Design a binder for this molecule. Structure first.
Ligand SMILES: [Cl-]
Ligand SMILES: [Cl-]
Length: 358
């Protein structure tokens, strides 16, 4: 049972993909982002407590989130609890082959960008190209890269550091095709300066990060194997301990699929629990499921999944939304469905999803 299920983006031409969701705690509202085949679009929605429904407003293009002559992709939003400022990180790639690419097929021409808002996402700043400052000399060592997709992370450390999940196709071989590896971008000063963390295992792509109780950053990545890949860091994402396979979280080979993970206050030793969404079919992108980890980020502690939606489902993004009407944690989930013909918003509580916990 759920509180709300609504298609917030629809296109028979598969125009909308790559969902990103952001919850604003003071406003008690959601920002739902998506790529529109390319620019980034957004729908704002307030949680109407009296009816316990999110009232989605009209779709609008995030005009500022783009570079002239470039396609924008991978919306990666974050709310800075210290300043209240919102960050929308995104990727920008030339719409057409550049002269440089004409001579160097694998030349990196991808840009890391951001737009910020100081009015709860109503208006955005001019885009800021973070590429050189965040990646540095390693830039030429990759063919391309991306952040997210989906929400990023803000730690509960003294600095309230920003952690942006990412992955890059490394041109390690001149003949072999570039292989992707996940990593994190880290800032302790609200995005003024950035550090590029070390890569986790090879062949890891779209990943998301969460912080759990010392405090560690857990990175959960898409793989080309039959299970998810996870790794934890004790230094805010700069370095990760050996990557591990999470057999309890299935990945459909050979392509795998993007999934989402968030932490939330334990509803009961550990301070936080993790909630994760991803398709549950052994080899198809179908049957979106929600999984719980009560002793994060231990791979063997993941629960069996509960079905959130049957049928075709792909990428998703989660956000905790405070406390639900029944008294248990409230969650919002944005996911691709029906052969990429729509992006659906699902709102449910922990009690609804995992009744055994109550
Ligand atoms: Cl919150
Ligand atoms: Cl807010």
């Amino acid at each position: 049972p759920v509180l709300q299920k609504e298609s917030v983006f629809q296109s028979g031409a598969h125009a909308y993909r790559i969902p990103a969701l952001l919850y604003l705690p003071g406003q008690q509202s959601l920002l739902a982002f998506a790529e529109q085949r390319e620019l980034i679009v957004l729908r704002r929605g307030d949680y109407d407590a009296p009816t316990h429904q999110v009232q989605w407003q009209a779709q609008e293009v995030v005009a500022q989130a783009r570079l002239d002559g470039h396609r924008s992709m991978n919306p990666c939003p974050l709310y800075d609890a210290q300043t209240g400022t919102l960050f929308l990180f995104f990727i920008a790639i030339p719409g057409q082959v550049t002269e440089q690419q004409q001579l160097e097929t694998r030349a990196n021409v991808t840009r890391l960008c951001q737009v910020t808002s100081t009015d709860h996402g109503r208006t955005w700043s001019s885009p800021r190209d973070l590429t050189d400052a965040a990646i540095g000399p390693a830039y030429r060592e990759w063919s391309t890269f991306a952040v997210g997709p989906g929400h990023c992370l803000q730690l509960n450390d003294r600095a309230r550091s920003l952690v942006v999940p990412a992955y890059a196709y490394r041109k390690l071989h001149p003949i072999q095709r570039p292989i992707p590896s996940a990593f994190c971008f880290l800032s302790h000063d609200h995005g003024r300066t950035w550090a590029r963390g070390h890569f986790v295992a090879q062949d890891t792509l779209e990943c998301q990060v969460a912080e759990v109780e010392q405090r560690v950053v857990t990175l959960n990545a898409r793989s080309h194997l039959r299970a998810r890949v996870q790794a934890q860091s004790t230094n805010d994402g700069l370095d990760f301990q050996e990557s591990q396979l999470v057999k309890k979280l299935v990945e459909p080979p050979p392509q795998g699929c993007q999934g989402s993970v968030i932490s939330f206050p334990s509803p009961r030793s550990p301070a936080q629990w993790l909630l994760y969404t991803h398709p549950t079919h052994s080899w198809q992108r179908a049957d979106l499921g929600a999984y719980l980890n009560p002793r994060p980020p231990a791979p063997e502690a993941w629960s069996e999944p509960v079905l959130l939606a049957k049928g075709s489902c792909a990428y998703s993004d989660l956000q905790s939304m405070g406390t639900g009407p029944d008294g248990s944690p409230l969650f919002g989930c944005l996911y691709e469905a029906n052969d990429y013909e729509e992006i659906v918003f699902l709102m449910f509580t922990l009690k609804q999803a995992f009744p055994a916990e109550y």
